[PDB]
Design an enzyme around this catalytic site. Structure first.
Site, PDB file in Angstrom:
ATOM      1  N   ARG A   1      40.839  30.765  24.495  1.00  0.00           N
ATOM      2  CA  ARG A   1      41.840  31.471  24.403  1.00  0.00           C
ATOM      3  C   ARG A   1      42.620  31.790  24.974  1.00  0.00           C
ATOM      4  O   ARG A   1      43.298  32.453  24.626  1.00  0.00           O
ATOM      5  CB  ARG A   1      40.574  32.688  24.523  1.00  0.00           C
ATOM      6  CG  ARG A   1      39.606  33.380  24.181  1.00  0.00           C
ATOM      7  CD  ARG A   1      39.053  34.680  24.559  1.00  0.00           C
ATOM      8  NE  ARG A   1      40.425  35.474  24.589  1.00  0.00           N
ATOM      9  CZ  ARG A   1      40.264  36.409  25.091  1.00  0.00           C
ATOM     10  NH1 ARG A   1      39.019  36.984  25.963  1.00  0.00           N
ATOM     11  NH2 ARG A   1      41.298  37.703  25.528  1.00  0.00           N
TER      12      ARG A   1
ATOM     13  N   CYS B   1      44.366  40.545  33.642  1.00  0.00           N
ATOM     14  CA  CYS B   1      43.272  40.699  33.182  1.00  0.00           C
ATOM     15  C   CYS B   1      43.694  40.837  31.677  1.00  0.00           C
ATOM     16  O   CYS B   1      44.291  41.298  31.462  1.00  0.00           O
ATOM     17  CB  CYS B   1      43.149  42.691  33.435  1.00  0.00           C
ATOM     18  SG  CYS B   1      42.081  42.722  35.026  1.00  0.00           S
TER      19      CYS B   1
END
Length: 262
Positions: A177, A232
C-alpha cells in the site's frame, strides 16, 4: 520495558478493583461487512467495556480516525464508565491491529497507567478463559479533560522534519500500500517517509522480541539518532510502530494524526 500483560495475570486480577478492562477491537476499513459492537456483545472479557475507536474519532474531519476534542472524549469516557485513574488493560481481536491506538489515546488523554493484553482476545480463548456476554453498564467513571500535546505533531512540524530530514518519518502501512495510491504526497506517502509495515513487529497478538524489533527497524533504515514521527494512513496501525519504539525506550516518538486544521 514491556507494555503488555499476560492472560494468566489478567485472569488472576479479573476482579482487581485498581484494574479496568477495555475492549478495543475494530474492523479494518474495507470491511463495513462487520459489526464490531455486536461481536463485543456476543463475547468479551468479563468487565470489559466497548472502546469504539470509530465512534470516538473527530467526525468533523475529512480524514478518517481523527483524534477527538479533549472534552468530547471526557464525555464518552464518562458515560462508558471508564475511570481515568485506574490501571487500564486494553485488548483487541488478537491481530494487534487497534489495541495500540486505543492504548495510545488513553495515555494521550490523561491515563497514567495503561497496558495491553498480550495476544488479545484470541490469546485469551486459547488459554481457555471464558467470555462474558451482553452490554456492560457501570456507573459514570471519573475522567475529566486532559491532553498530552507532546504525543502529536502538527502538519506544520512535519513539514520541517520532512524538509531538512531532522526527524525520520515512518509509514506503518504494508508495503503493497506504500506505493499504490489508494487513500487520497509522492506516491501516496510523505516525501522522505521510511516504510515500516506494522505487521513485521507483530507475532500473534503482541510485539516481537526487543532484538527482533531492533533488527526490523535497523533493516528498514531507522536510527535512534534523530527523532521519529509516525504518520497515520492505514487508518490506525501507526500506533503499533509507536508502541514498538516505546518498547525499545525511544523517547519523544510522536504520532502524525493526519493533515487537518489545529
Amino acid at each position: 520495558t514491556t507494555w503488555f500483560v499476560g492472560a494468566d495475570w489478567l485472569a488472576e486480577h479479573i476482579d482487581d478493583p485498581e484494574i479496568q478492562i477495555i475492549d478495543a477491537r475494530m474492523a479494518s476499513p474495507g470491511q463495513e461487512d462487520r459489526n464490531v459492537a455486536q461481536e463485543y456483545l456476543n463475547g468479551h472479557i468479563p468487565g470489559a467495556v466497548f472502546f469504539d475507536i470509530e465512534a470516538l474519532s473527530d467526525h468533523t474531519s475529512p480524514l478518517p480516525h481523527m483524534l477527538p476534542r479533549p472534552e468530547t472524549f471526557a464525555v464518552a469516557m464518562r458515560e462508558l464508565g471508564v475511570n481515568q485513574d485506574k490501571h487500564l488493560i486494553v485488548y483487541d481481536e488478537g491481530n494487534l491491529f487497534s489495541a495500540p491506538r486505543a492504548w495510545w489515546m488513553l495515555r494521550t488523554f490523561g491515563v497514567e497507567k495503561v497496558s495491553i493484553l498480550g495476544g488479545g482476545l484470541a490469546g485469551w480463548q486459547r488459554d481457555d478463559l471464558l467470555l462474558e456476554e451482553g452490554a456492560v453498564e457501570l456507573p459514570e467513571g471519573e475522567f475529566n479533560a486532559a491532553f498530552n500535546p507532546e504525543a502529536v505533531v502538527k502538519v506544520t512540524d512535519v513539514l520541517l522534519a520532512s524538509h531538512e530530514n531532522t526527524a525520520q518519518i515512518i509509514d506503518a502501512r504494508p508495503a503493497a500500500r506504500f506505493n499504490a495510491e489508494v487513500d487520497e504526497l509522492r506516491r501516496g506517502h510523505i516525501p522522505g517517509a521510511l516504510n515500516v509495515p506494522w505487521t513485521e513487529l507483530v507475532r500473534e497478538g503482541e510485539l516481537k522480541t526487543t532484538d527482533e524489533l531492533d533488527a526490523i527497524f535497523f533493516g528498514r533504515g531507522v536510527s535512534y539518532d534523530k527523532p521519529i514521527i509516525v504518520s497515520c494512513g492505514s487508518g490506525v496501525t501507526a500506533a503499533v510502530v509507536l508502541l514498538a519504539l516505546a518498547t525499545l525506550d525511544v523517547p519523544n516518538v510522536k504520532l502524525y494524526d493526519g493533515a487537518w486544521s489545529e
